[PDB]
Amino acid sequence: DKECDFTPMLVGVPPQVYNFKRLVFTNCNYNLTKLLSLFMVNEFSCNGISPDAIARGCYSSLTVDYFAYPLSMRSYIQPGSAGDISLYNYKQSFANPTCRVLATAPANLTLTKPSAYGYFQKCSRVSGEHNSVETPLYINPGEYSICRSFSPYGFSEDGEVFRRQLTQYEGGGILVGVGAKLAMTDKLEMGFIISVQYGTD
Amino acid sequence: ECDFTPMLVGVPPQVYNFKRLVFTNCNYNLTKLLSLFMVNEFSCNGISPDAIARGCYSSLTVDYFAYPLSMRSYIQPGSAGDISLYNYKQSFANPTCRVLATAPANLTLTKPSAYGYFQKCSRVSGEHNSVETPLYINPGEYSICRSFSPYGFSEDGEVFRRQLTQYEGGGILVGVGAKLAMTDKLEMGFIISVQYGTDTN
Amino acid sequence: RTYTLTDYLKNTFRVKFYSLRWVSDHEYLYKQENNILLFNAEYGNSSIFLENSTFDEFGHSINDYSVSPDGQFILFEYNYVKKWRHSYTASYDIYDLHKRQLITEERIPNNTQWITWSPVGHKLAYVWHNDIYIKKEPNLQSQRITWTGKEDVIYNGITDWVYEEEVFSAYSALWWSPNGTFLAYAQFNDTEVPLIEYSFYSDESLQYPKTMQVPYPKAGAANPTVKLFVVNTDSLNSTANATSVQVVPPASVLIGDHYLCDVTWVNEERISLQWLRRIQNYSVLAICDYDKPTGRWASHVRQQHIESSTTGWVGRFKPSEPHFTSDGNSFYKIISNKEGYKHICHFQVDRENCTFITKGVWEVIGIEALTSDDLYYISNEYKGMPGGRNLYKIQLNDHTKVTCLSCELNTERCQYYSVSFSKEAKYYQLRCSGPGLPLYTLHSSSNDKELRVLEDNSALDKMLQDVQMPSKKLDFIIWNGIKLWYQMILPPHFDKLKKYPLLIDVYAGPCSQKADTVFRLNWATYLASTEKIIVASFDGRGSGYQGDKILHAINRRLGTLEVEDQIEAARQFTNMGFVDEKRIAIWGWSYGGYVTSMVLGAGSGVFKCGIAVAPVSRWEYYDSVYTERYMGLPTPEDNLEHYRNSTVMSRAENFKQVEYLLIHGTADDNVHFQQSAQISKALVDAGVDFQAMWYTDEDHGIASSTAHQHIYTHMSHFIKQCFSLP
Amino acid sequence: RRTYTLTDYLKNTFRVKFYSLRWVSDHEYLYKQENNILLFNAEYGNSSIFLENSTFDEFGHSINDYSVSPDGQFILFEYNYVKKWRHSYTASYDIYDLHKRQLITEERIPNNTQWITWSPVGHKLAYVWHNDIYIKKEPNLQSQRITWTGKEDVIYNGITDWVYEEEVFSAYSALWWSPNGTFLAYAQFNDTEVPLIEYSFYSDESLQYPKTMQVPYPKAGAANPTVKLFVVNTDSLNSTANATSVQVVPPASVLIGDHYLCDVTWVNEERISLQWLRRIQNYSVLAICDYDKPTGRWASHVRQQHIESSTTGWVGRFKPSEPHFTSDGNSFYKIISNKEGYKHICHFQVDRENCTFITKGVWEVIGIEALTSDDLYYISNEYKGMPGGRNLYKIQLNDHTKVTCLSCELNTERCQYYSVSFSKEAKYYQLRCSGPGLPLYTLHSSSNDKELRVLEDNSALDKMLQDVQMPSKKLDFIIWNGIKLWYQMILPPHFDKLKKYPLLIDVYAGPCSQKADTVFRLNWATYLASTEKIIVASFDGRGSGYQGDKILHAINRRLGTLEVEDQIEAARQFTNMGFVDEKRIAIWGWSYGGYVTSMVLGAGSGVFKCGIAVAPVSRWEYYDSVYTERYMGLPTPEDNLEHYRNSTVMSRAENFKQVEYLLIHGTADDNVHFQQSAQISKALVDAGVDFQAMWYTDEDHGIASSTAHQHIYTHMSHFIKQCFSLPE
Ligand SMILES: *[C@@H]1O[C@H](CO)[C@@H](O[C@@H]2O[C@H](CO)[C@@H](O)[C@H](O)[C@H]2NC(C)=O)[C@H](O)[C@H]1NC(C)=O
Ligand SMILES: *[C@@H]1O[C@H](CO)[C@@H](O[C@@H]2O[C@H](CO)[C@@H](O)[C@H](O)[C@H]2NC(C)=O)[C@H](O)[C@H]1NC(C)=O
Ligand SMILES: *[C@@H]1O[C@H](CO)[C@@H](O[C@@H]2O[C@H](CO)[C@@H](O)[C@H](O)[C@H]2NC(C)=O)[C@H](O)[C@H]1NC(C)=O
Ligand SMILES: *[C@@H]1O[C@H](CO)[C@@H](O[C@@H]2O[C@H](CO)[C@@H](O)[C@H](O)[C@H]2NC(C)=O)[C@H](O)[C@H]1NC(C)=O
Ligand SMILES: *[C@@H]1O[C@H](CO)[C@@H](O[C@@H]2O[C@H](CO)[C@@H](O)[C@H](O)[C@H]2NC(C)=O)[C@H](O)[C@H]1NC(C)=O
Ligand SMILES: *[C@@H]1O[C@H](CO)[C@@H](O)[C@H](O)[C@H]1NC(C)=O
Ligand SMILES: *[C@@H]1O[C@H](CO)[C@@H](O)[C@H](O)[C@H]1NC(C)=O
Ligand SMILES: *[C@@H]1O[C@H](CO)[C@@H](O)[C@H](O)[C@H]1NC(C)=O
């Protein structure tokens, strides 16, 4: 009935890439292009749909994954890209028409900059007798990392290590996670993942 | 019309650092000053009693300091103690009035941190530093231990030491301070001596 | 059957004593079979003041007790923990005599440092956490007097290390008034005093050892400052804070660093304080009177008394304490006469001169009791032997009339006396300690008669009849016109014709006396009885009780004369025909180890082997109050050259001729292990082989049962191997 | 002299000459001759002067060492040497120009420098000063501070803490340049929570109050220092900005708890090999890290990880062995344990987890010395089946079955113990023979494996020893319960098997130690055998190394057990051989050797009459963590606390009443603290046991000061001459 508002993406401190916040909207229609004018778009790749046909159409759902992402790491969020981002942080799903937007936030917008950037270098599980078996845990498209709970807001240094005992019900062993810290850029660079489903509302 | 403003302003001096106001030709008027102090003691002696209110206005000298009434017995004539020997001794050769008084509220009179008098002021001389000759003050003059701590003593029994130069007789001057607590009201003491002349006034 | 080493280290032949506590002019207490007993002095009938069943029912071993002067309460000391020579901490529980109950309301806290009753009544003053607390009634709250107490910085009511060991010879610094109106105390400030730091290894369970830190003033270092305060305990409002007035010392000692060496209450409004300069050549006694309207204690120049030494230091160690007559306007004091001998002088308060009442080629050891007609003093006048002590009494009205009270009780058995008088000097106990078995007797001052024998050691006598005990000769030898004394402990069946090995026991510190008439059952007794060794001691220059001309001969020259006389005595002992000139040794402790090391390093060829236990090596390593009393300050403007000349390390090369055993404890707080660590480093630098031994966590005494028996067992094997004794 | 006297050993009368060289290229080296640095050509031995001693003495100080830059253009001069601990030391440095032949006074190297080194190429300098790293691009230029967190006794940047220098790294340095000097790896150690041992130093006689030393020392079970490894790019520097260092995180399997960094090996300028070891040292992981140009980090992938563990004991001998990579950098060779348990060379691949062994047998490879594109050179104890021998071997990397010894038969009677120093590219190698004869130094060429010339033959010592009665050495073995255990006897001159000599058991017995060898030595045992006619015997029982995992790991989690008993059994075996006086048998040792001696004297077996313990261990809870925990684990009730308490010297105090005991220790010992010997004497006093003791003021683990070195052996001589009733 009403208008889908994007205000949570514009106020406060945005989350990290591994702790991204997800907004799904139903029973409303959107004005998608007014959000694009608020930011300086640096990329707009749309697999499944078109860079233009996304702002027009009534769907059964419209989802937006938003987080703080540095443009110096733009190559590690591309489709099929290997590296730490797609393995222990965020991997874009392609089970629906989707777009990927990397944009820079001006100081005019009322979103604050976090302390720094952050991603996980390692997210492995040490198991086996004598704790000799180490299996890295890779994320599934659209899901969250299992090392997410270690440092939600951010890391304190580069190469910060977190350990935790996995319960008997959680399979077994020790979950190890190493964080990575990048210096905060001049203007807040963001990342937006928009997706769409159908069913005629 | 010789206003005694200095005796009424600032923090009063300790007894060993007594200040003197000498007037020669300027005409004086008392009772003005007396009306500013509650005379807890007005023991006049010498030659003139309350007739000191008149005279010929010639060489009116007045000493003033901060003196507690708990030590009032040591400011009287011929009184033994550490005030008459190391602090103040009234001169009874010329007409004089001894005045002790408490001060009213904020009579532009500051409050010293505490009262202070010297309990010892002696010279340690002779070969092997064996002879201790106590140095007693003369009526009207100051003490040799006045140079130590004119502001006051940080502790009751504060010891001071100095080498008396060859021109100062030789030996070591030792002065020990005594500290009395601050009364709730500022207690003072005044000595008013007057001289005559062979010419005028 | 000879006196073996096992008998000395397992305490087989035990000497008995009779320790009493006078609680009145005619009564005393006696601990007998864990029963506190009260005795009437006139007739000897006893009473059960407290029984067996009273103690040992509190849940802990009781160490000591302290009956209040009014006989209503007793302190009970337990949880005793030793700390240095005189200091210690403990717990205390009060016991009511009347109700027969243990007071549980407002108990004395744990780790209390000092506690004492008032001279009258039942008032308590204790020091806890370096702060003084006044307990008026045993069941009421204590009242905190000081708030500046801080560990190893500020000491209130207690002493630091250098005051406890050298000045006061006691942990206490609290002085009640005659009937408890005031409480005089001292305050010590060890903020700028450097700290000695050594390791403590504790039990085997400790992984990382502990580093002990004690504020120690070495020669020339910063000394603790002293301030004496007096507080009125009878004006103690439980809602207000305590007020402490300070007594300012006279100006003669305020020109530099000074000490407080005596606090004696004259009356309730008069106190006596003795001050001493850092250079201990000048002292002053200040008689301070009270000022009621002012509230202060003033030292006036007319009631001051100066005593100084032109040839050395004041007093034997510190100036002698005064003894005031019952009116408070005069006192008697032991000072030095014109010829150098220490005798009793009669002082007036406001008169500078004094009149000697005792005179002679002897010395007064101490004033014991002062009545209105008699003065009781211990002296060494009898038989001209400086090694003796006898009780004398002198009339204050006619000084000519002097009576010896102990000279001829058992002249063969008793030549060294100590006395303990009752209140008002009605009865006195004589404690003989040699040369026979110790004899304790009770007397009466009126007729000067012996009432009964309290202890004669009849059991020790019977036990010593079937053992070949050694003898002891006490003679003298005149040398350069001066008479010096020595003592030999001759082996049993002493043959003057055969040549015996000689071991020279030595201390030789200032005002020491190793030649006395005291019965001992020690290591020298085993060496003479079992090993047939002659053990001898000599009191040369520096030894006291023989005059200032003999005591002050080593002034500012330590390590001289006192070391040469031990060497020359060994030569003259060889001149007696029964000494094997090829088997001569020397051993000592503390200063004895210093002299032993200087003797062995002298290269005189007289001594073969030697033992130094916890020895002083360099006088700049030892504490200030002791060292500077005899050597001054270590500055080029004072006596720095003789500080450097009199070092043991300077003579390390001469040790290539002797067999040297060096022993020291790792936790020694007095003569630090540093002193022995520099000795061994010089012996290694000089290419000298020697024997050594360290005792872990052992103090200056090495007095733990296992440790005490280990050092004498080790020194036995060393002396025997050096003497070819099987 | 007629016999080898104690004066001949304490003072150095019969001196052994050495030939120490520094390979400065693939065919030339430096050599010092009468304080002249000489440059030699390896082919024809012709030489020329590199620096004259007229240059050495234009300074106002004594030069202690030198270090020429790998470009031949600068010389680093070391002076003001001040020792601290085993390997650490502080000194000053002056850079000397060679083309200008002058000293550099513009922007100097500060006093009290802790470490300093050149880049592997050129003249770049990185040094540690006040626990911080400084890099100099050119010697005449000002340095650039790399780290800013260095704090004394807390945080170490580029240098090791106490336990890392002593037990894991065997060096004070933690700086690693890249092969061309673009990157600079370093370790940061954090000793904030590490406890401090506090002993006393008394110093010169002038010092009134002694000093209290404070060394961050983690004893058994205490908190260990944490370690991070950072890599900085030296070619992206800027004198205007601060330098950025990137941390290389360890593999996740080692981050589960405490761990160590035991090795750092550069493969190439973008691939670095790191070896991490857990606190429970039976699991190590060699992590190969590859640089990423885009982000600038170093990636440690699990796919290129290789696990080296041990189920019977600890990894390696004292630590995991270092890797030796090939030229391409996609494979390496290292010495690990085979299935039988013997250390042999395995061929690893960077991306495949398994390795192929290239050597096998009942012998061990001591160390890989060179790896070319065709041959691998290694030192082993294979020749004549002697574990106490060492020879150089060459194996063909294409036909591993083609192995040739290069030093076995050169002089079989004079030389059975070899080391080697290869030139760059392994074109020439110097053979250093230690024994059993007089030391022999020769130079060889790798092409035809032919010897070029003799560098040092020790001809002066051979003629000096002709008129002296030297003692012989008997190296043999016995079989105890079907096990070969080797021993070594130093027999007096004109040794007669009928006569009964006094025996002195020389013991160290530490894990992987070896006392029986073919090595020439002019030591104190030489004096006791030549002059006082005392058979000195050493025995390698259980726990000794170079013989397999079975013998080495026989004391695992149980120190003070089998190695002590085997020293008792060796004395019985030596006694019933015929030529030993049963009534006169002694035993002495140093550090672990003194510990075993104290345990032996506390066994009450009645075999030994006297014994000397010098700086011994008394309770394994008192020693450092890395060494003690490697063999005995953690002293907690859930591990091996009971074996920590059954293996104390204090617990055997009552048995010392049957022997004569001499306890020696230095007051300033930092390895085995005087607290160890303090508890020993505290136990024997509580038991009524008499003994002799001797402390040495301000001496360290080795009583190595000239005055103290002569004093400790003159004292021990008198103790043995009394215990054996020998003429003085
Ligand atoms: C010695 O005898 C006298 C009597 O001649 C005792 O005096 C009495 O002692 C008892 C027991 O202590 C007290 O209960 C009495 O109060 C005392 N008599 C008076 C009149 O007071 C004296 O105490 C005895 N000494 C003892 C038993 O040690
Ligand atoms: C003990 O002595 C120290 C000095 O060694 C006193 O501390 C000084 O106090 C004054 C005044 O409060 C300061 O100006 C100084 O800076 C202080 N010095 C130091 C080193 O602390 C201390 O007050 C004394 N304590 C007592 C109880 O008298
Ligand atoms: C105080 O002790 C010193 C010795 O330590 C004596 O002072 C000496 O006095 C004479 C005067 O004739 C000076 O020449 C010396 O230089 C002084 N000695 C020093 C070390 O300075 C003095 O005799 C002693 N005082 C008394 C009262 O006996
Ligand atoms: C060295 O180690 C200590 C910890 O042992 C680190 O200090 C910590 O610093 C953080 C951040 O300020 C604090 O939250 C902790 O409380 C500190 N711990 C302690 C014990 O002080 C220090 O950061 C380390 N230094 C380096 C360079 O890693
Ligand atoms: C490394 O050594 C430890 C011993 O400290 C081994 O831990 C043991 O593991 C077995 C399981 O196989 C348990 O039954 C034991 O109780 C463990 N011992 C202790 C003291 O906890 C560990 O297995 C070893 N690791 C390897 C790879 O050999
Ligand atoms: C006092 O008690 C002890 C044991 O504590 C006992 O042996 C002794 O006999 C008792 N005293 C008397 C006089 O019975
Ligand atoms: C310097 O080198 C020359 C060249 O061999 C040599 O003869 C001389 O002894 C050396 N002098 C010093 C002091 O090294
Ligand atoms: C090292 O110290 C000495 C004096 O201690 C000083 O002369 C010298 O200049 C210092 N070194 C440097 C490089 O400044």
Residue numbers in the entry:
A (entry chain C): 388 to 588
B (entry chain A): 390 to 590
C (entry chain B): 41 to 766
D (entry chain D): 40 to 767
How is this structure described in the published paper?
Middle East respiratory syndrome coronavirus (MERS-CoV) and the pangolin MERS-like coronavirus MjHKU4r-CoV-1 employ dipeptidyl peptidase 4 (DPP4) as an entry receptor. To understand the mechanism of MjHKU4r-CoV-1 entry into cells, we determined the crystal structures of the receptor binding domain (RBD) of MjHKU4r-CoV-1 spike protein bound to human DPP4 (hDPP4) and Malayan pangolin DPP4 (MjDPP4), respectively. MjHKU4r-CoV-1 RBD is composed of a core structure and an external domain. The structure of hDPP4 or MjDPP4 consists of a α/β hydrolase domain and an eight-bladed β propeller domain. Both DPP4 receptors bind to MjHKU4r-CoV-1 RBM via blades IV and V of their β propeller domains, in agreement with the complex structures of MERS-CoV RBD-hDPP4 and Ty-BatCoV-HKU4 RBD-hDPP4 solved previously.
For the MjHKU4r-RBD and MjDPP4 complex, crystals were obtained in 0.1 M Ammonium tartrate dibasic (pH 7.0) and 12% (wt/vol) PEG 3350. The two MjHKU4r-CoV-1 RBD-MjDPP4 in the ASU are almost identical, with a RMSD of 0.335 Å over 936 aligned Cα atoms. However, when hDPP4 and MjDPP4 are superimposed, there is a 4.8° tilting angle between the respective MjHKU4r-CoV-1 RBDs bound to them. The larger BSA between MjHKUr-CoV-1 RBD and MjDPP4 also results in slight changes of the contact residues on the binding interface. Compared to the MjHKUr-CoV-1 RBD-hDPP4 complex, there are extra contacts between MjHKUr-CoV-1 RBD and MjDPP4, which involve residues M460, S511, Y525, A567 and L569 of viral RBD, and G296, D331, P333, S339 and R342 of MjDPP4. As MjHKU4r-CoV-1 RBD is orientated differently on hDPP4 and MjDPP4, there are also interactions specific to each complex. The RBD residue D471 only forms a salt bridge interaction with hDPP4 R336. In contrast, E544 contacts K267 of MjDPP4 via a salt bridge. Unexpectedly, although D471 is not in direct contact with residues in MjDPP4, D471A mutation showed a 10-fold reduction in affinity of MjHKU4r-CoV-1 RBD to MjDPP4, which is likely contributed by allosteric effects. The side chain of D471 forms a network of hydrogen bond interactions, either directly, or through water molecules, with Y506 and Q508 of MjHKUr-CoV-1 RBD, both of which contact MjDPP4.
